[PDB]
Amino acid sequence: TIENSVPVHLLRTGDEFATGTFFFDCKPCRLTHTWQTNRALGLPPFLN
Amino acid sequence: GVGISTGTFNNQTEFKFLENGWVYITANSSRLVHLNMPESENYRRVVVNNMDKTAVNGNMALDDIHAEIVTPWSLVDANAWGVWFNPGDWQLIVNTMSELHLVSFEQEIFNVVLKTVSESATQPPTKVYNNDLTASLMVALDSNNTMPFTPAAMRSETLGFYPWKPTIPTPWRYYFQWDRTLIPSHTGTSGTPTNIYHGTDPDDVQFYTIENSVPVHLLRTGDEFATGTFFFDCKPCRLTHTWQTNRALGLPPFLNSLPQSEGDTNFGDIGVQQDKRRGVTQMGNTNYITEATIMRPAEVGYSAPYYSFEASTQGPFKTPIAAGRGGAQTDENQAADGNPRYAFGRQHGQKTTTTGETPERFTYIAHQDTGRYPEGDWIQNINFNLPVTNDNVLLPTDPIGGKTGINYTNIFNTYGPLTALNNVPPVYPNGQIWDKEFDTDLKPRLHVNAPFVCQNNCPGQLFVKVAPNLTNQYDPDASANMSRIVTYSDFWWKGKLVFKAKLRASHTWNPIQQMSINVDNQFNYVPSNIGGMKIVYEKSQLAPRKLY
Amino acid sequence: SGPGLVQPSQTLSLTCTVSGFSLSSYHVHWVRQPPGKGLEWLGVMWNDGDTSYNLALNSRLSISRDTSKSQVFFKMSSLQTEDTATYYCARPELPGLTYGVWFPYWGQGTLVTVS
Amino acid sequence: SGPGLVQPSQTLSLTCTVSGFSLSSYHVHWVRQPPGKGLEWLGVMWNDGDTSYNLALNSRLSISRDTSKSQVFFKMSSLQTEDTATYYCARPELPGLTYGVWFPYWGQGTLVTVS
Amino acid sequence: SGPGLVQPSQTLSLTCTVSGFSLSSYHVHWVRQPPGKGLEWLGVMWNDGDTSYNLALNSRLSISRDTSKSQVFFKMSSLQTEDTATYYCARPELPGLTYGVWFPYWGQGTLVTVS
Amino acid sequence: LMTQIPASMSISVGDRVTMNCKASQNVDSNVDWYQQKTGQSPNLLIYKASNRNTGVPDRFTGSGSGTDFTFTISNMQAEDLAVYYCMQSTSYPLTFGSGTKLEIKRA
């Protein structure tokens, strides 16, 4: 129950409230799908 | 310019030493290369098909259909262990050394020559040869790797071993993107299996063409070309197999009575009954604590479904296995639980005088003992009523849906929490050195191919083609047939590779198996009076060690 | 196509709408005489194809509008006639390779194109 | 569409191939009873349309493959039947506003869809 | 060896135990018909050998277990039979060159291998 | 390639007949047959032998394999008449045969 934990700014209104910026921690994400399936892994056989 | 030659020719093995067990194994090699002029010209896309075989009922896969893009170029490449090492030199590495590290690689090409053939008609004909100075050779080499990748031995068309015999590179090619789906079949199957091709998804196409990417030094001949050295990034590999299986993990129970007479049928006694033993266990009801049932810190190896082909863009393909067959002596055929089996020919065995042709085949077992032996596996209910009645448990003799070949063992898997295994042992000299690492983010924990993997990027390859010539005729950007002067050109090739290793040390009371000559193979190493050669395979992971 | 001589332009179009399975790519324009012949069964363009006599090329987008083209000119001095062009349009080939094969139905009887 | 009750899915498709003028956008699926009614004549999607009773929406790409959709469910408890779907397909409206108007031809007689 | 056709694998093994003088290397597998022929008398492998028709290769370790192999496939369409394989096994040749020569005893009469 | 013979058949309604074919390259069973069903035409009947479907079974029957095929007609009515075709399906290209010509015997 948050009232047992975290503060509460109270507002009548002229006033504003602003949270400072909390960064992230991550690894990237690729926008590029991978078409090659288990067929395309290798060097294909040589046509005679 | 022509009146010099800048190169040298080296096949050597030199052991330089350092302080405290670190020893650099520095190997060099070289070969002579002859290179036909590619008869085709334009880049070429081809689709191969054979269907009467997938047509007839049965034949899960005796073949599939692939589509490739054949360039005129050709690939001279390293990445075998027969290109630099000798079964003479190979000995002192595997007996004294418990580990490897990879360091650096480099290549260069020197003293090129270009020749010419003028075929007479009214003559016998005789082939004239006049060395041509002003003709040219193309060399294209990328350290960016941008242009697509293969190693080569999924076949071993790679450079020939020995350094007195020439060798040829191979035309270079890569997979394209199509779609295929194939429905099952068997002998008793009726109707049609519905085998169909399926065009090409236009969404995704790669034509990669090096002339659109990477530079090309051009060479007439006095000149040389040298790639600088690009390092590796790797983790070591152990040369020492682990014999301990899930039996040897722990402290063995204490004998309460020790046997007496020498010579054996002499069997100690666990000394207590099965009921009163004391120890940790995991099981449904234990008045029983055995040598078998007991808690082990974790498993070894994994039981994998074998001969199960999952379907995808290419449909049927085999699902590989990372373990060895060690512990299974009754299942061979070729590589029963899997034991990768090389098939090569004419170039590294099947002794070099062989009339006609025919492949060469040997099953390479593992020397590592991790038992995956499927026979002798079954399951019980949680009640443990012993002796157990046939209706409450399973056997490998019990069908699935009324079949026979399947036991239950063809559908099973574990792998999950506790498993582990050792990196695949290198093989020789048909094996592979390094392998590029996958592009996606989850990075499979190993490969059932190469011992070593560059975690960032591996060095590239070396591409080469004869430079074209025309006499007089032409049409601009024409796929009609332009005439040509049949030529060929030879260039020497050198190579260098750097290793780092540590000497092992005894701490046991026993000697240890080594490779050595005997009479089993008396001469598999010494040439035959016609010039015969083999280089029979040799199994190296020779050194037993502790595990847990 | 025609009419009539010696090699005028276009006039082969049918059928809209719902012209078949879009597999990349498909037929059938009926093809041909009918006693023959004919026509080794279109691909998709850069380079996938194609028909058995030069300048028989076919092209079209299988998306909507589902249509056809040209077709085509080509060499008409043999007085041959296929004037329609109606579909279902079995398996082309290229895709195919069952082996092959088979051709269910057709539509829209005789259209004849002059020599 | 149906069959049969109370609101199952799809089963309205025709006609391939060459389904008409691609003007953005067109008809005609025939429409309707025939004694009625009906159907205030499709637009193109975000927002261009549309038909006169809710959940009558239509959508399709006029490029190839030239096709149609859905259509649709919709409210069928009135036992009404239009089971084809064949074209030419005059001027829709939206385009139109000649004023209007007129409708040349049609195709593919009775297909009846059950209640 | 066989049985039976056209070129199946293995099935030539005898004799254990005490298979002869280990000189590097020795015979005799009996060899052959008996009316012929035959078989120009095995070496030791890389390179020492060998027999008179290709793909007749032999290999084995003269240490214990004292055994033999393959043998072999080879080309059997001539319906020939030697199905044993028993020893003493004189001087091979290669060693030899007495001049030559001679062959004391043998063992284990008729074993016949099918065509 | 493929040819289609016999010809000149005049039959009573319902009676049977044999129709056959011969070819060079070994065709597996790709053999097919097109039958009007006059309108919209030719409106194939049996797929590669044998499938009696399309549009309802047991109107004709095909059977046989390899370089030959034998085409067979069980139920003959006024709903089938005149002349018919055969195909082979192999490689590039397709090819057609030509002709049978069976019309109901009228005299």
DSSP structure string for F51-62: B--SSSSSSEEE
CA E76/CA E57 separation, integer angstroms: 15
To the nearest 10°, report the CA torsion of C100, C105, C106, C112.
90
Interchain contact, C18 vs D18, CB within 8 Å:
no
Calpha distance B397→B412 (Å, rounded): 15
CB atoms within 10 A of CB B468: 16
C97–B196 CB contact, under 8 Å: yes
**DSSP code, position B532:** B
Q: What is the CA radius of gyration of chain B?
A: 29
Q: Cis ω on the peptide bond leading into residue D65 (within 30° of 0)?
A: yes
In this structure, what DSSP letter does residue B227 have? P
B499, containing H or E segment: strand B487-503
Radius of gyration over alpha carbons of chain A, in Å? Answer: 28
Environment class of B458 (CB within 10 Å of its CB; exposed 0-12, middle 13-18, buried 19+): buried
Strands F9-11 and F102-104: parallel
Judged by CB atoms closer than 8 Å, whether chains meet at A44 and B174 is answered as: yes
- Amino acid identity of residue A6, one-letter, is V
Neighbouring CB atoms inside 10 A of B501's CB total: 20
Amino acid letter for position D30? W
Task: Tell me B286's DSSP state.
Answer: -
Tokens of B12: 């050597």
Cis peptide before B387 (omega within 30 of 0): yes
How many angstroms separate the CA atoms of B431 and B156, rounded?
9
Reported as half-sphere exposure (CB side, CA atoms, 13 A), residue B222 has a value of 5
Angle at B253 between CA B249 and CA B258, to 5 degrees: 130
User: How does strand B166-167 pair with strand B170-175?
Assistant: unpaired
Would you say B451 and B457 are in contact if contact means Cβ atoms under 8 Å apart?
A: no
Mutation target for B interface from A30, A39, A47: give the one with most B CBs within 10 A.
A39
B150 close to A42: Cβ distance less than 8 angstroms: yes
Provide CB contacts within 8 A for E94, sequence distance 6+: E25, E41, E42, E43, E48
Half-sphere exposure of E71 (CA within 13 A, CB side): 25
Inspect the structure and tell me whether chains E and B have 3 or more CB pairs less than 8 Å apart: yes
List, in order, residues 6 or more apart from C59 with CB less than 8 Å away.
C45, C69, C70
Q: Return d(Cα B340, Cα B330) in angstroms, integer.
A: 17
CA C27 to mean position of chain CA atoms: 6
* Torsion of the alpha carbons at B448, B450, B456 and B459, rounded to the nearest 10: -150
Q: Which of B313, B311, B306, B48 is nearest to B183 (CA)?
A: B311
Q: Which two tokens stand for residue D67?
A: 């096709």
Whether B351 and E44 lie within 8 Å, measured CB to CB: no
Cα–Cα dist B337/B332, whole Å: 8
Measured CA to CA in angstroms, residue B325 lies from A31, B546, D42 at distances of 41, 20, 67
Establish how many alpha carbons lie within 13 A of residue D72's alpha carbon, considering only the half-sphere containing its beta carbon: 13
Give the list of residues 6+ apart from residue B508 with CB closer than 8 angstroms, or none. none
- Provide the 3-class DSSP secondary structure of residue B89: helix
> What DSSP element (H or E) covers D16?
strand D15-17
Q: What is the rounded distance in angstroms from the CA atom of residue B130 to the CA atom of residue D45?
A: 73
* CA-closest candidate to residue D81, choices D15, D35, D49: D35
**Closest C-alpha among B320, B327, B334 to residue B377:** B327
- CB count, 10 Å around CB of C22? 19
User: Is D32:D82 a contact under the CB 8 Å cutoff?
Assistant: yes
Other Cβ atoms less than 10 A from the Cβ of E81: the count is: 16
Nearest to B298 by CA among B433, B137, B420, B455: B420
What is the bridge-based pairing of β-strands B67-76 and B170-175? antiparallel
E83-98 burial, b at 16+ Cβ within 10 Å, e below that, comes to bbbbbebbbbebeeee
- Tokens found for residue B417: 């929490």
Burial label for B324, CB within 10 Å (0-12, 13-18, 19+), is buried
Contact (CB<8Å) C106/F90: no
C-alpha torsion B154→B71→B32→B527, nearest 10:
30
CB B180, CB B98: distance < 8 Å = no
Per the listing, tokens 């990748």 go with B149
Q: How many residues does chain E have?
A: 115
CB-nearest partner of C97 from B49, B200, B202: B49
Contact C65 D22 (CB under 8 A): yes
CB B435 within 8 A of CB B449: yes
Instruction: Indicate the DSSP class of residue E71.
Output: -
- Per DSSP bridges, beta strands B137-140 and B360-363 are unpaired
Is residue B211 classed as helix, strand or coil in its secondary structure? helix
Q: Which helix (H) or strand (E) holds B90?
A: helix B89-96
- Report the Cα F52 to chain-centroid distance in Å: 12
* Whole-angstrom distance, CA of residue E39 vs CA of residue B423: 46
**Residues E75 and E55: beta-carbon distance below 8 Å:** yes
End-to-end CA distance of chain E: 10
- Resolution (angstroms) equals 4.1
Chain B residues with beta carbon closer than 8 angstroms to that of A36: 175, 177
Does an H or E element contain B96, and which? helix B89-96
Contacts of B524 in chain E (CB under 8 A): 45-47
Q: Which of B540, B124, B156 is nearest to B343 (CA)?
A: B156
**CB of B460 closer than 8 Å to CB of B144:** yes
Alpha carbons D26 and D20: distance in angstroms, whole number? 8
Dist. CA D80–CA D34, nearest whole Å: 10
Please give the helix or strand (H or E) that residue B466 lies within, else none: strand B462-466
Give me the phi and psi of B67, to 5 degrees please: -135, 130
CB atoms within 10 A of CB B160: 18
Residue from C86, C102, C108, C110 whose CB has the most chain F CBs within 10 Å, to mutate: C102
CA-to-CA distance for B68 and A42, rounded, in angstroms?
12
Locate the chain A residue with the closest alpha carbon to B69.
A44
Q: Which two tokens stand for residue B217?
A: 């030094």
Q: Max CA-CA distance within chain B?
A: 102
Alpha helices in B202-323, H assignment, sequence order: none
- What are the residue ranges of helices labelled H in chain C? none
Among B233, B244, B235, residue whose Cα is nearest residue B421? B244
CA gap C64, B326 in Å, rounded? 61
What is the four-CA torsion angle of B269, B274, B278, B283, rounded to 10 degrees?
A: 130
Domain range list for chain B: 1-548
Strands across the sheet with F18-22, in order?
A: F3-5, F18-22, F68-73, F60-63
F59, F64, F65, F68: CA torsion to nearest 10: -100
CA distances from B414 to B200, B305, B372, B398 (A): 37, 10, 12, 20
Say how far apart CA C15 and CA C7 lie, in whole Å.
Answer: 24
Angstrom distances, CA of residue E27 to CA of B46, B289, B529, D28, E64? 54, 56, 22, 92, 16
Interface test with C, best of D10, D18, D70 (most C CBs within 10 A): D18
Q: Which amino acid is at E105?
A: Y
Q: Which of B477, B424, B429, B481 is closest to B450 using CA atoms?
A: B424
Residues of chain C contacting residue F42, judged by C-beta atoms under 8 Å apart: 34, 106
Cα distances (angstroms) measured from residue D34 to each of B324, D80, D100, F48: 74, 10, 20, 42
Q: Is B217 helix (H, G, I), strand (E, B) or coil?
A: strand
The SS3 of residue B93 is helix
Nearest in space to B63 (alpha carbons), one of B73, B48, B75, B43: B48
Residues B150, B175: Cα–Cα separation, whole Å? 10
CATH number listed for the domain at residues B1-548: 2.170.30.10
DSSP letter string, D52-90: SSTT------SSBSP----------TT------------
The pairing of beta strand B67-76 with beta strand B225-226: unpaired
| Residue position matching structure tokens 């007949």 | F17
Q: How many residues does chain F have?
A: 107
Looking up tokens 């040209």 gives C70
Do you find a cis peptide bond into D34, omega within 30 degrees of 0?
yes
Taking the CB of residue B451, how many other CB atoms lie within 10 A of it? Answer: 24
Residue C64 C-beta-side C-alpha neighbours within 13 Å: 24
CA distance B533 to B488: 28
Count of Cβ atoms closer than 10 Å to residue B486 Cβ: 13
DSSP C3: S
Q: By the 8 A CB rule, do C16 and D19 touch?
A: yes
Residues forming beta bridges with residue B33, ordered by sequence position: B167, B491
Please, which experimental method was used? cryo-EM
What whole-number distance in Å separates Cα of residue F41 and Cα of residue C20? 18
**Cα B239 to Cα B463, B500, B517, C22, D86, distances in angstroms:** 33, 13, 20, 56, 74
Contact D111, D83 (CB under 8 A): yes
